[PDB]
Ligand binder design. Structure first.
Ligand SMILES: CN(CC1=NC(=O)NC(=O)C1)Cc1ccco1
Length: 161
């Protein structure tokens, strides 16, 4: 069903999070961690303190899809063997966020064409810079479009709220 998912998403905040490659999403799915540049680290830390749930909705650049979504379980803290873009040192990253995956299934952008994000000029929700916040209603509807991930039990996530 969808009821525990809706409970986790109640009054949540949502952020569009890009990845440079599939490898880092794979690492994040296996290890329950994410790292960003300092600009988005600051935004996510502020949001983590502000809301019952902060949801990261992941999209590998140029893939045409979202690869799933996860809930922050921590603020950032300061080695994960990320596959970084050429010329980027691990020292340019902010800290590491712990995350609990809510859905590891993908959703193609074609399926979210009817959703617009008020915080990005009501452009289709797939459109946004890395770190773009997605307004509550749009973010909730987007998350509900993903195929159910029956491998995940949200019982333990609810207890972290
Ligand atoms: C794991 N992490 C991958 C990404 N995390 C993000 O938050 N945005 C991205 O584009 C890619 C490291 C990183 C931060 C910036 C570039 O590589």
């Amino acid at each position: 069903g969808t009821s525990k998912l809706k409970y986790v998403l109640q009054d949540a905040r949502f952020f569009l999070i890009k990845s440079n490659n599939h490898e880092n999403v794979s690492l994040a799915k296996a290890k329950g961690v994410w790292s960003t540049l300092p600009v988005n680290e600051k935004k996510l830390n502020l949001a983590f303190r502000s809301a019952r749930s902060v949801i990261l909705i992941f999209s590998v650049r140029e893939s045409g899809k979202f690869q799933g979504f996860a809930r922050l379980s921590s603020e950032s803290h300061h080695p994960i063997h990320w596959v970084l873009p050429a010329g980027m040192s691990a020292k340019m990253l902010g800290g590491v966020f712990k995350i609990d995956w809510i859905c590891r299934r993908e959703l193609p952008f074609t399926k979210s064409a009817h959703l617009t994000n008020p915080w990005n000029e009501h452009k289709p929700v797939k459109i946004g810079r890395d770190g773009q916040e997605i307004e509550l209603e749009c973010g909730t509807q987007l998350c509900l479009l993903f195929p159910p991930d029956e491998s995940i039990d949200l019982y333990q996530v609810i207890h972290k709220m």
